[PDB]
Write a protein that binds this DNA or RNA. Structure first.
Lengths: 62, 362, 102, 134, 58, 108
RNA sequence: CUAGUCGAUAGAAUAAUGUAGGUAAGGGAAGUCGGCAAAUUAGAUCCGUAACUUCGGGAUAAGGAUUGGCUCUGAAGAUUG
RNA sequence: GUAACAGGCAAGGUGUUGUAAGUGGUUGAGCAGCUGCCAUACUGCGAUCCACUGAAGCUUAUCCUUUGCUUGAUGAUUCGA
């Protein structure tokens, strides 16, 4: 978080800093669309779902 | 600020019995509403607020310091703890709470609104302030404050003319400035690489830190200051209809007698329209447009003969501030300039349509 | 729909005014883009779907409102003179003309 | 000295070294401000003469017996405006000075143009020889 | 007290102006800077059509 | 109703002020989009092309001090979108904006 | 104008210090190692021009005056006589 | 506050530049077509000037004022002794 700009919508998180990482959101939309799609396969009710365990890692730098 | 001629009343200066053209300031002070009474004791730590008694009804203008969102709320302060004046209370609630100031306390300060909706701003949310009473035998101070709960007090009873007021406010914000503006440091030459409006040296080798005596980029604008020894030249009282419409000796005097008002032509620019009472001090209190300057009475003695005299002012300049005033009253333009191609040559259409209105019924 | 990068380059080399001045009909780009040969694009040009977008008027009105006022000398004072007098009319070509007169 | 009452601060328009008219009828035609006559000073700051501020002068393009000497002089009018104490802001058409001994007595007998009131009030001898004060 | 603008013809309430002294000896009150500048460019006031002197040319 | 078409004047120089020249007036066509979404509530603001031709009439730098624009908030015909409404602002040529009191009555 | 491009990562906002460009009362080099940097002058027609000189120059020395717009007048030629 | 309000418009006010386009002019150097037989003439000439004209522009974007037209709530996130 250095040197990320401060804002006011990051009061709710209780940390004065934060950004709006557009394409980082939209790769996780396009994942939770695909995690929800297998939830509809087995017959899980999609509205009773919580994000239980999410993690991000590294890959081979290009 | 608005520029006053007067005739100076000194001993052997060089302006004696002569005229000077002074700069004055206008503070629109609509009457404070006093709303509650606080006592303080002494501890070996300093004073300490002990009791707090509020009046029961408070204006909706001035229960608005207690909220940061008022449109959104349910307006529930002071709804519960203002019922203490309506229960028994005569053995239990409040007469005890006024007993406590008679005995324990030493300093009784009083809480006051400001009726800021008379000022015509977009603000609509008040300013609460603790004013200390300073009249003897604090048995008096608790009865003075028990009289004037919920009742207004106006600026003519606090101050007089020819007193030395003090002004306590905030200055005007400039921003993150730099060093030849914050501290007014020299400029480095035109041959200065990497920056000339700096301080060049920032310290010695040793003490090998930087000190808090060096000039850095540390704020300009918006500091608290108190300024002493402004002198009140006039106290306005300017509203309305004592028998008929009344504005006269607001900006009038005994050498002018056109009666108008302190507000120039086209208003005070960015500042207002002033209709209410005003205190008119000497030159320059602090701040921007529409600040809350509180005026405290002077802490000190005045024996300087500049501080002591009474001056009655000759003239109050009510010409515009919005570019360069040429005339004083709006009917002073008709002394110089008569019929502009306007409602002086639009009346001659307005007179014949009213004659066509007279030709309508006939 | 499609890119008429090809379709424009063939138009400006058929009309022979380069493609600053080519107009392809912008409601008929579906039907323009199906056409690849130039013999298939003169048919779109004889028909009214590709036009040659005429030249800019660089009007000569004021140029000859002025040089009818020079004939009366309206703009030749000493503050409209910037050549040395030998440059405006070379005196070698006044004594050339004068000798040929005599 | 001789400053009667409070001579209020006016704006100084003549630093070291400016060149003033010598409105004198002595023969000097320029006066050049070497230095002004009341000045403590702070660092880097140039002394500067107001109206009725006596100073130290040389005549640069004058007479032969007034040149290459150091003499006193008094400013009688300047071109940068100055607030008089009744809201007036007077300035003049060009700057001018007057050769004076150390007492305050003039050197010549005429002053060719207006003397400001500020100069006349402190020097009564320049006041007497004046054409039109203020 | 109330003084007269020398270029135009307006009144000058106290404060409100600058005042020029030529070394003729004469003193000139102007009302604005606009009048003061426009005198030093020698715009004659009979010819500037917002004045009093142009206005007394009717 | 939600289909109303409202004709109103807009003081432009009030808005493209504080902005350096040669940045207006492609700024003045953003300030128009801010003007419509405060007057018709919608977000999809379409600007009639003739208005853009009018704004770029006096170059990038100079911009007309006041315009007389006519917004029409219509329901989004096709392309089923979140925004069911969209405002279309067209250019009205008038002579003198003086005493041109804005009004909503535009049947056409 | 003809042809040719708007491709230089885009939006918001205009703090400090900057790189680049303007203007600034009064004074005018006091600044500085030093007028560095900036400022002034500048095209054209007519006047006019100093020391010194290798007689060629110096010299655009210096120092001045003029100039827009509009409506006119005069002078300069060609083929036919 | 279904409007104690408010935003956008508009009207005033104050300013600022300095007399708008437009017709009309006995304002206009002068020159022409006809200048006429008389009446003695139009202008397509033509910088300017004048009237309508202190007009016209701009005027809060960090100016002032409202019984003028217009518009409006209709979200989101967290929190107890």
């Amino acid at each position: 978080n250095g040197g990320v700009g401060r804002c006011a919508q990051a009061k709710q998180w209780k940390t004065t800093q934060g950004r709006w990482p557009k394409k980082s959101a939209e790769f996780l939309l396009q994942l939770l669309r695909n995690a929800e799609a297998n939830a509809d396969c087995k017959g899980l009710d999609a509205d009773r779902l919580v994000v239980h365990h999410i993690q991000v890692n590294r890959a081979q730098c290009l | 600020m608005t520029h006053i001629v007067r005739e100076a009343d000194r001993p052997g200066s060089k302006i004696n019995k002569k005229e000077v053209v002074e700069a004055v300031t206008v503070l629109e002070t609509p009457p404070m509403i006093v709303v509650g009474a606080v006592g303080y004791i002494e501890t070996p730590f300093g004073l300490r607020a002990l009791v707090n008694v509020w009046a029961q009804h408070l204006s909706e203008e001035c229960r608005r310091r207690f909220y940061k969102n008022w449109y959104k709320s349910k307006k529930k302060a002071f709804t519960k703890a203002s019922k203490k004046w309506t229960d028994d209370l005569g053995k239990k609630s409040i007469e005890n709470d006024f007993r406590k100031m008679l005995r324990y306390c030493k300093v009784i300060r009083v809480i006051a609104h400001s009726q800021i909706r008379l000022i015509k701003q977009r603000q609509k949310k008040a300013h609460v302030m603790e004013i200390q009473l300073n009249g003897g035998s604090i048995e008096d101070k608790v009865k003075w404050a028990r009289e004037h709960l919920e009742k207004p007090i106006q600026v003519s009873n606090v101050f007089g003319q020819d007193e030395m007021i003090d002004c306590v406010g905030v200055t005007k914000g400039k921003g993150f400035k730099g060093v030849t503006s914050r501290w007014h440091t020299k400029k480095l030459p035109r041959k200065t690489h990497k920056g000339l409006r700096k301080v060049a040296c920032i310290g010695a080798w040793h003490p090998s830190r930087v000190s808090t005596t060096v000039a850095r980029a540390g704020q300009k604008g918006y500091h608290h200051r108190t300024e002493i020894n402004k002198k009140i030249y006039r106290i306005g009282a300017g509203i309305h209809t004592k028998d008929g419409k009344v504005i006269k000796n607001n900006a009038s005097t005994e050498y002018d007698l056109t009666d108008k008002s302190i507000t120039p032509m086209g208003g005070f620019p960015h500042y207002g329209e002033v209709n209410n009472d005003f205190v008119m001090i000497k030159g320059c209190c602090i701040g921007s447009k529409k600040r809350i300057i509180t005026l405290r009475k002077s802490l000190l003695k005045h024996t300087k003969r500049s501080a002591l005299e009474q001056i009655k002012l000759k003239f109050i300049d009510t010409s515009s501030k919005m570019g360069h005033g040429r005339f004083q009253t709006p009917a002073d333009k008709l002394a110089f300039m008569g019929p502009l191609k306007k409602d002086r040559l639009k009346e001659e259409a307005a007179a014949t349509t009213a004659a066509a209105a007279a030709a309508t019924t006939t | 729909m499609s890119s008429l990068k090809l379709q424009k380059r063939l138009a400006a080399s058929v009309l022979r005014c380069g493609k600053k001045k080519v107009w392809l009909d912008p409601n008929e780009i579906n039907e323009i883009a199906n056409t690849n040969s130039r013999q298939n694009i003169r048919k779109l040009i004889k028909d009214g779907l590709i036009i040659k977008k005429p030249v800019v008027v660089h009007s000569r009105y004021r140029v000859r409102k002025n040089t009818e006022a020079r004939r009366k000398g309206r703009h030749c004072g000493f503050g409209k003179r910037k050549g040395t007098a030998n440059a405006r009319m070379p005196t070698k070509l006044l004594w050339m003309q004068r000798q040929r007169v005599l | 000295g001789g400053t009667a009452g409070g001579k209020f601060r006016i704006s100084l328009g003549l630093p070291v070294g400016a060149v003033m008219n010598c409105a004198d009828n002595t023969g000097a035609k320029n006066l050049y401000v070497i230095a002004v006559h009341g000045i403590r000073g702070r660092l880097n700051r140039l002394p500067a003469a107001g109206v009725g501020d006596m100073f130290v002068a040389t005549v640069k393009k004058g007479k032969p017996e007034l040149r290459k000497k150091v003499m006193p002089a008094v400013v009688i009018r300047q071109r940068k405006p100055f607030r008089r104490r009744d809201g007036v802001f007077i300035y003049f058409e060009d700057n001018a000075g007057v050769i004076v001994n150390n007492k305050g007595e003039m050197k010549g007998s005429a002053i060719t143009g207006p003397v400001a009131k500020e100069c006349a009030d402190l020097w009564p001898r320049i006041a007497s020889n004046a054409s039109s004060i203020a | 007290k109330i003084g007269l603008c020398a270029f135009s013809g307006y009144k000058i309430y106290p404060g409100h102006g600058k005042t020029m002294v030529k070394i003729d000896g004469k003193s000139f009150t102007f009302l604005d800077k606009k009048c003061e500048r426009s005198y030093l460019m020698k715009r004659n006031p009979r010819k500037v059509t917002w004045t009093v002197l142009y206005r007394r040319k009717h | 109703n939600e289909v109303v078409t409202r004709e109103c004047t807009i003081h432009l120089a009030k808005r493209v002020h504080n902005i350096g020249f040669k940045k207006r007036a492609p700024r003045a066509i953003k300030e128009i989009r801010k003007f419509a979404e405060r007057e018709m509530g919608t977000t999809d603001v379409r600007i009639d092309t003739r208005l853009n031709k009018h704004i770029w009439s006096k170059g990038i730098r100079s911009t007309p001090f006041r315009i007389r624009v006519r917004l029409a908030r219509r329901r989004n015909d096709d392309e089923d979108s979140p925004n069911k409404l969209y405002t279309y602002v067209t250019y009205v040529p008038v002579s003198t904006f003086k005493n041109l009191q804005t009004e909503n009555v535009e049947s056409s």
